[PDB]
Each structure stands twice: as C-alpha cells, then as structure tokens.
Motif scaffolding. Structure first.
Motif, PDB file in Angstrom:
ATOM      1  N   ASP A   1     -26.217  88.044  41.767  1.00 51.32           N
ATOM      2  CA  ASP A   1     -25.900  87.277  40.570  1.00 51.32           C
ATOM      3  C   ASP A   1     -25.373  85.905  40.971  1.00 51.32           C
ATOM      4  N   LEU A   2     -25.893  84.858  40.322  1.00 51.86           N
ATOM      5  CA  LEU A   2     -25.580  83.493  40.740  1.00 51.86           C
ATOM      6  C   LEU A   2     -24.112  83.146  40.524  1.00 51.86           C
ATOM      7  N   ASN A   3     -23.476  83.721  39.502  1.00 51.56           N
ATOM      8  CA  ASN A   3     -22.080  83.399  39.228  1.00 51.56           C
ATOM      9  C   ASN A   3     -21.139  84.149  40.166  1.00 51.56           C
ATOM     10  N   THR A   4     -21.314  85.467  40.288  1.00 55.18           N
ATOM     11  CA  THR A   4     -20.449  86.244  41.171  1.00 55.18           C
ATOM     12  C   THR A   4     -20.774  85.998  42.639  1.00 55.18           C
ATOM     13  N   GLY A   5     -22.037  85.718  42.955  1.00 50.05           N
ATOM     14  CA  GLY A   5     -22.437  85.537  44.334  1.00 50.05           C
ATOM     15  C   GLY A   5     -22.392  86.787  45.180  1.00 50.05           C
ATOM     16  N   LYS A   6     -22.269  87.959  44.566  1.00 44.76           N
ATOM     17  CA  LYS A   6     -22.182  89.224  45.276  1.00 44.76           C
ATOM     18  C   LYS A   6     -23.485  90.000  45.136  1.00 44.76           C
ATOM     19  N   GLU A   7     -23.687  90.938  46.057  1.00 41.16           N
ATOM     20  CA  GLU A   7     -24.892  91.755  46.046  1.00 41.16           C
ATOM     21  C   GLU A   7     -24.841  92.757  44.899  1.00 41.16           C
ATOM     22  N   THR A   8     -25.916  92.805  44.113  1.00 40.57           N
ATOM     23  CA  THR A   8     -26.022  93.745  43.006  1.00 40.57           C
ATOM     24  C   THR A   8     -26.637  95.077  43.414  1.00 40.57           C
TER      25      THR A   8
ATOM     26  N   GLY B   1     -31.512  80.560  43.477  1.00 40.06           N
ATOM     27  CA  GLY B   1     -31.890  81.526  42.466  1.00 40.06           C
ATOM     28  C   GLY B   1     -31.394  82.914  42.807  1.00 40.06           C
ATOM     29  N   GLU B   2     -31.504  83.806  41.820  1.00 42.12           N
ATOM     30  CA  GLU B   2     -31.050  85.179  42.006  1.00 42.12           C
ATOM     31  C   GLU B   2     -31.937  85.941  42.982  1.00 42.12           C
ATOM     32  N   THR B   3     -33.209  85.559  43.093  1.00 35.31           N
ATOM     33  CA  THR B   3     -34.146  86.223  43.989  1.00 35.31           C
ATOM     34  C   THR B   3     -34.506  85.404  45.218  1.00 35.31           C
ATOM     35  N   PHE B   4     -34.478  84.079  45.127  1.00 32.87           N
ATOM     36  CA  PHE B   4     -34.816  83.210  46.245  1.00 32.87           C
ATOM     37  C   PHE B   4     -33.578  82.462  46.723  1.00 32.87           C
TER      38      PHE B   4
END
Length: 859
Positions: free
Chosen positions: A60-67, A133-136
């Motif tokens: 997630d771009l805001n949290t910056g943590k792995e989902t 980005g969330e994926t790249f």
DNA sequence: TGGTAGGGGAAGGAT
DNA sequence: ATCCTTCCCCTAC
C-alpha cells in the motif's frame, strides 16, 4: 514512388510544439537535374516506450508495508490501466510483457527482469519520472525523446543513406527544401549501406558590424559568402574550395554612400550587391541562403556573437522569412539554448573546431590565419569604419576585407579537415554530425553507449534534468642532468587496455565493486573498446597496400585517427559527473589499476638492479649508465618482455631513448630524443614537456632565452664552455631590453578567462581580467569566457603591484605615459625561467644569473 | 556539457 | 613584515 532513398545529415525534434515527430534533413539525387538537392523527411508517430519494473509483493502506497499479496504481470497492467492511465489521461495505449537487462545506478533493480512495455502517443501527457505504484517499484523511459528512440530503434549510426518505405506526400510544404516526404511510422525507415556518400553544399561567410550612435545595438554593414556545391566529405577538399560568391553592403540610418558606388562597382565588374537599408541586406542574404541551400554553414565566432546578432537584427529590422536561415518553416524565433535555430543546416565554427584539433596561444580568427594559413590578417578597427564611409576606396576595401575573411575561414576549415573528420567521428560514435562539430566529446560517447546497450537489450538510464576520485600515479623524480642514455617505457592506451584486460563494465561488477572472475565473459564496455581497436587495426592494414588510390591513404588516415580518438575518450565519459553513463566507482577502479600496474612495474624494474628516475601515469624512465645503443635496446626489450609476461592484452613498449635529459620537477623535463637512422647511429631532436618555455603564460623573451639555455645544457660540449655561452647571451638579453632592440611582442603574456570578466570576485587582483575589462569598455570585439587576452605590464609611475600594473599592448603605443617595465622582465620573467632550468647543473647560480642580466644580486 | 596530478604566481588572512 | 591557504591558469598523463 515505391520507396524514397535519401542521405540524412541533420535531425530536428520539437518536444513541446509538436511531439512524436522527428524531421530529417539531407540530400537526394534528382536524375533530371543531375544534382543532389536538399530534402526533408517527416517521420511521424514515434511511440513513448515505457518500462514498469514490478515489485515482488503488492504494498500500500500510504503505509508502505507489505500486504502479503503477490504481484503478477496482470496486476501491474491493472494498476496502469485503472489508476495511472486514467489519472494522467492516457486514452489509448499498448501493452506487452518483455524481458530487459539493466546494470546502472538505480538500486534494487535486477540485472535481468520482466518489465511491462507500454507504448502510447507522444501527444498524451507525460508521466513523472519518480512515479511509484502499488505493483511497480520504478518506471524507465519516462522522458526518452523521440529523436533518441528513432535513432536507437532504427540503428541510425551517423549520417547514412535511408530508404523510406511507403513515403507520403506532405499536405502543405513544411520545409525550405527542394523535396519533401512523410513517414507514417518509424518502422518504415531502414539503413542502406552499399552507397557512397553524396557531396555537400558548403557556404562559409563573414560579416562586419557597427554600433549605432543612438542605440547600443549592433548593425550589419556588410556580409560576404563563398559557396561550393560539391564539397566531398569522402576525399580531400576541392581546389579551389569555392565555386561562387556574393557580397552585400548597406548603409546605417544617418550614413550615405560615397559617390558613384554602382558605376565604380559596375566598372570594377565585382559581383557586389547594394542594399539601401539593412533590412534590404538581410532579406538578400536570407534569399541567398534559401537559393544556395547549403548543408554546412561555416564561420568564425558564430555562437558567441555572429549568429546571435544576425537573428537579433532580423528581429529588429523585421526582415521577412527568418526561418530561411534553417530548413524548417517556423513562425517565430526563440529567445537569445538558441543552437536549434539553424536546424537542417550544420554550423561549423572554425575557432571551436581548432580548439579540438590544434594548440594555439589564442583561438581568434586573426591568430588562426597566422598559424594555419601562414598569412597575416589585417583587421579594421570598429572605430575607423565610420570614417571608412567617407571614400569608397576605403569602403570597397572594407568589403574586400570581410570577403577575404570568409575565404580564410573556408581555407582554415579545409586545412584542418574538420568536415571529413567530423563525419568519421559521427559514424563511429553514432550521434548527430551537427552535435559533433559543436558539442563536447561527452555527448558522442554517450551516443556510442546508448546504441551499444540498445543493441544488447538494456534499459539505458534516463536523461537527467576539488575532484571526485584518485587519478594517475606520478613517481617523485630523481632531479638532475643525465649524460648517459635514458630509456623510456610506457603502456599504449593504458586505461582502454585496463578496461579490456580486467573486464571492467557496468555489467561485470556488482556496483564497492571489485573485478569479476576472469572466467566471466567480456562485458559490453570492454567489447566496444575491442571493436574500435580491431577496426583501427584493419584500417592500418589497408594503408599498407600498394597500387592504391592516393586519396584513400589520406582518408584511411582520417578514419584511423577517429578510431583512436573514440577509444581514448571512453574513460573520460565515466568520470564526467554530468554524464548519462556516470560511473565514478568504475572510473576509480580503472585509475586504481593504473597506479597498481605502474607501481608493480617500477618495483619489478628495481628488482632487476636498474635505476628508475621518473614515472608518470603510464610511463617509466630508466637510467642505464651506458653509451652503447646495442646494450640499451637489448635491455629495453628485456624489460619489455618481462613486463608483458604478466598481462594478456596490456603491453608495454619502448617509447624512445634520451641522449641527454634535464629532469627538473614533476611533469617538467627536457631531453634529446634518440632517433634511429639507416646508418645505425642516431640523430637527435629535443623534446620539451612542462617547462615554462612550453607554456603560453610566459613572455616570448623568457621562453626564447630559456630555449637557448636548454639547447646549451643538452649540447655535446664541455661543461666549462656551456656556462660561458649562457653568460655571454644572458648579459646580452639584459642589454637589449633597456635598449629597445626587442619588439613589443616579446613582452606579452597570454592568459585566458574561465568566466566572464565581470563575474570575477576581484578584477584588480588578476592581471588578465583587468585588461579584459578595458577591452570591454572599448567598442572593439568583446572578451568572453574562454578567450585568451594578451597583456604587457608597464610602468605607470605608480608603486602598485606588478600585477595591478597590467595593460594591453594596444595601450602601450596609444598612451605615451606607459613604458615597458625593463626591470620586471629581467627579474620576474627571464630570471626565474633560466634560474629554475640551471638549478641542477653545477656552475650557474641564481645570484650569478641575476648578476649577468644586470640587477642587484640577492639570491 | 571528458578526467586527475601537479607546478608556479598572486591575493588575502592571521599574526 | 612572514607564514599559510586559497585561487588562478596552464600543463602532462
């Protein structure tokens, strides 16, 4: 018809006003006229090639943590089509997964990876370079220009013949060329290789200006130009270098011509055009450029003054059709950058080209004609041109002056062979020839690597919007004079060979980086250097043939020179901080190996019971204490073969023997280079490197006397008679200075400005800047950055420092209160030059030399 | 809009 | 005054 064959020379790209279009300008054969004409090919629909590097896990771009959600190639395609293409208004686009290689500065990027190639129209908005980005994780190719994409995708390596499959008619004439055609897609342009290059249309020109009485802006008084319509780049320059000419002359606002100009010109039968107003003059020159349609415009000081004034006067006088100075129709000119003003036409500034090919004290036109053409040039002062309008005999000489200036420029261009050489440099590097003529060497090797990595499917880095690492090793010299034979060994092109020998590339190291396993395959950067060396070798073999075209050995020579100049400039592109391929770790790695290779070589020679006395970046000087060349050349190859037994590709060779050597300090020495002869017994010439007599910031009086001292020290005479000849001449020079027998040209010292003379912190401190400000106060041609100003310090009756008493040589003859400081040159110039030269030789002292010139001995 | 290593000079502080 | 660093330009590699 079916296809369109033309030879492209220049390209123009308008990033902002018309994106995705690359204009090509070149020659095309018209069989009906039996002449090449200028053509303009419009290549449309250049795509925007993007590369999205997918992340390992969706975050997630805001949290910056792995989902915890894995990222796939369909997920990265989803984020672009959903959140990226919509937010940046990208209606239609293309998508396809591809595998790209990468080995550059961005961290956390694999060597090989799967990217998402996205192509869309250049008319659509551009993404941000730092887009995440969330994926790249990163995205490449964001700001890659249309011209760069077109030149790389189609393998356009320099000017060449191109075929345009499916050519299209242009709706309205967009260019000032004879023939025009359009390409729908870049894929319709291919490279033809089995055709000779066409001759070019060259036009060298000059102009004379004058400041207006009311406004301080300049004003074009007269222009002259020489034209040759079949100037070949493949062979030597034509003789004569021009086939036609035209000269123009007009009046200022408050000035009128001397009587009977037409009749006298009509009587003199000289092809000279008379213009009423300056606006009429510019329209005549524009129409001449349009009709001649030259491929290369030649001149002196074009970018600094001439071209900037020409555009400015055309704007002020409102001359119609300004864009005829180039080849593409445009409504309004840019502000005066501004190098993209004569697009479609190459601009050759002989003063710039000379700075890359020869070495001179000053690089202005008057000094070039004196050194290259061996002919003096008389210049008319900008203050006397107003009085030259009184009599036509003084004004027709003014046109003949500028007309003769245009011929000098054309002659200088031919003698330096800048056109045949620039084409070779461009075909080797694979850039644009107009940029080769003007731009620096960094942009060339930038293009050579941009091709090399495109060829090998690499993502090249995007174009970005004291010292920094250690360099060569200079061993401390054993100062003194040597009577025996001095042997000099060195490695030919050390840094290019270091790269090949140790496989140093962006791809071979884990760039911090250390040399890879020698079992690893040769990298991209070393393999490109290997090509240039092999290509240069093959050209050298072609020069060996007999019964060959005498014009080929001259062209082969131009080529092999370009191959070396390209392979040697490869290292400098790594250390340049603003280089697209900046790699300071790789540059430091190369220079470190050079130091280690040299240090190991010096210690190896010492272990052989040999005395080394000096060593610079790649060379080593060995003292042999032997007068038989049979033993020197035998020992020369013994050390050679012993060193070369350690390196596969790096080799060391004898660079000559020295009969006598005067080793003074680091990078400063003088020797008598042994030259072998057919008789088996040498003849010697002297070589000067680093000495004050070699520099240009010392006066010719001190440099000539020091050169006479060097000739006496290296002479094959007795020790007691050498000091006697120096004494008799050093007391003679001390008498001719105060007697006035020496000219004023022997007292001028030359220093160049690295910045504008107004942009200096203190001008009264530096001498050459104080003289530069005086020149900028006069009406003559200004002194900008890079210009060399010659000055002569004088005696103005003031006790200011000798540097504050610096004046121009033109101020010495005009102002009678300025006289040559006789004591200065005898103490501050001639004395230290000779004192430092005679420091190691026993017999001549500093105070003894001062007593010879004729001053109070205090040393 | 190649590089660093190095000499020789003068300016400008600090003393 | 002198000592020392800084800056200047030009060199060799």
């Amino acid at each position: 018809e079916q296809v369109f064959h033309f030879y492209w020379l220049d390209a123009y790209e308008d990033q902002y006003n018309q994106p995705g279009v690359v204009f090509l300008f070149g020659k095309v054969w018209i069989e009906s006229a039996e002449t090449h004409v200028s053509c303009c090919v419009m290549v449309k629909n250049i795509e925007r090639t993007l590369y999205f590097l997918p992340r390992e896990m969706k975050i997630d771009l805001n949290t910056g943590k792995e989902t915890g959600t894995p990222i796939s190639m369909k997920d990265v395609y989803e984020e672009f089509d959903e959140k990226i293409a919509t937010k940046y208004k990208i209606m239609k686009f293309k998508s396809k997964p591809v595998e790209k290689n990468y080995a550059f500065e961005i961290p956390d990027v694999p060597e090989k990876s799967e990217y998402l190639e996205v192509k869309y129209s250049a008319e659509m908005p551009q993404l941000p370079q730092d887009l995440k980005g969330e994926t790249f994780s990163h995205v490449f190719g964001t700001n890659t220009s249309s011209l760069e994409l077109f030149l790389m995708n189609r393998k356009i390596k320099g000017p060449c013949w191109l075929e345009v499959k499916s050519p299209q008619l242009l709706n309205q004439p967009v260019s000032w060329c004879k023939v025009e055609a359009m390409a729908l897609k870049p894929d319709l342009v291919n490279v033809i290789k089995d055709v000779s290059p066409p001759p070019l249309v060259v036009m060298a020109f000059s102009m004379k200006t004058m400041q207006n009485a009311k406004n301080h802006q300049n004003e074009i008084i007269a222009m002259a130009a020489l034209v040759h319509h079949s100037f070949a780049l493949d062979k030597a320059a034509p003789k004569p270098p021009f086939q036609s000419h035209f000269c123009v002359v007009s009046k200022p606002k408050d000035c009128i011509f001397p009587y009977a100009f037409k009749e006298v010109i009509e009587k003199k039968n000289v092809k000279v055009e008379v213009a009423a107003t300056e606006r009429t003059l510019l329209g005549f020159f524009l129409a001449k450029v349009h009709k001649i349609d030259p491929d290369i415009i030649v001149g002196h000081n074009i970018y600094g003054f001439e071209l900037e004034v020409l555009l400015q006067r055309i704007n002020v006088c409102k001359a119609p059709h300004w864009s005829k100075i180039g080849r593409l129709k445009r409504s309004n000119m840019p502000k005066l950058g501004e190098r993209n003003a004569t697009c479609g036409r190459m601009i050759c500034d002989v003063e710039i080209s000379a700075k890359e090919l020869i070495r001179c004290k000053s690089y202005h036109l008057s000094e070039l004609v004196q050194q290259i053409l061996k002919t003096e040039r008389v210049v008319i002062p900008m203050e006397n041109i107003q009085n030259m309008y009184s009599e036509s005999s003084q004004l027709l000489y003014l046109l003949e002056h500028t007309w003769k200036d245009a011929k000098f420029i054309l002659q200088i261009m031919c003698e330096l062979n800048v056109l045949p050489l620039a084409l070779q440099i461009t075909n080797i590097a694979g850039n644009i020839m107009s940029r080769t003529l003007m731009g620096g060497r960094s942009e060339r090797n930038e293009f050579l690597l941009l091709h090399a990595f495109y060829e090998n499917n690499y993502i090249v880095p995007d174009k970005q919007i004291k010292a920094a690492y250690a360099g060569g090793l200079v061993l401390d010299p054993k100062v003194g004079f040597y009577d025996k034979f001095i042997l000099l060994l060195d490695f030919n092109s050390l840094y290019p060979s270091i790269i090949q020998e140790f496989n140093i590339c962006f791809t071979t190291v884990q760039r911090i980086p250390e040399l890879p396993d020698p079992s690893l395959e040769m990298g991209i950067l070393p393999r490109e250097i290997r090509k240039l060396v092999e290509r240069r070798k093959q050209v050298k073999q072609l020069m060996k043939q007999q019964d060959l075209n005498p014009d080929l050995i001259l062209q082969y020579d131009i080529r092999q020179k370009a191959l070396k100049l390209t392979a040697n400039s490869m290292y400098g592109c790594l250390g340049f901080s603003y280089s697209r391929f900046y790699a300071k770790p790789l540059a430091a790695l190369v220079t470190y190996k050079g130091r280690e290779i040299l240090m190991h070589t010096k210690e190896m020679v010492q272990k052989m019971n040999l005395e080394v006395i000096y060593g610079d970046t790649d060379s080593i000087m060995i003292n042999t204490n032997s007068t038989n060349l049979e033993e020197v050349f035998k020992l020369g190859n013994k050390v050679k073969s012993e060193v070369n037994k350690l390196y596969k590709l790096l080799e060391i060779d004898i660079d000559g023997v020295f009969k006598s050597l005067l080793l003074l300090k680091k990078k400063k020495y003088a020797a008598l280079v042994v030259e072998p002869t057919s008789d088996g017994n040498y003849v010697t010439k002297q070589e000067l490197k680093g000495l004050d007599i070699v520099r240009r910031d010392w006066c010719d009086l001190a440099k000539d006397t020091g050169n006479f001292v060097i000739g006496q020290i290296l002479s094959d005479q007795s020790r007691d008679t050498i000091v006697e000849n120096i004494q008799k001449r050093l007391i003679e020079i001390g008498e001719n200075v105060l007697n006035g027998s020496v000219p004023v040209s022997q007292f001028e010292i030359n220093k160049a400005l690295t910045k504008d003379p107004q942009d200096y912190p203190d001008k009264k401190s530096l001498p050459h800047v104080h003289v530069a400000l005086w020149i900028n106060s006069q009406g003559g041609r200004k002194v900008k950055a890079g210009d060399t100003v010659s000055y002569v310090i004088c005696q103005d009756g003031s006790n200011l420092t000798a540097s504050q008493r610096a004046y121009a040589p033109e101020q010495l003859q005009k102002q009678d209160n300025l006289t040559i400081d006789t004591q200065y040159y005898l103490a501050q110039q001639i004395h230290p030059v000779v004192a430092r030269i005679c420091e190691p030789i026993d017999g001549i002292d500093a105070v003894l030399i001062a007593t010879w010139l004729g001053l109070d001995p205090t040393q």
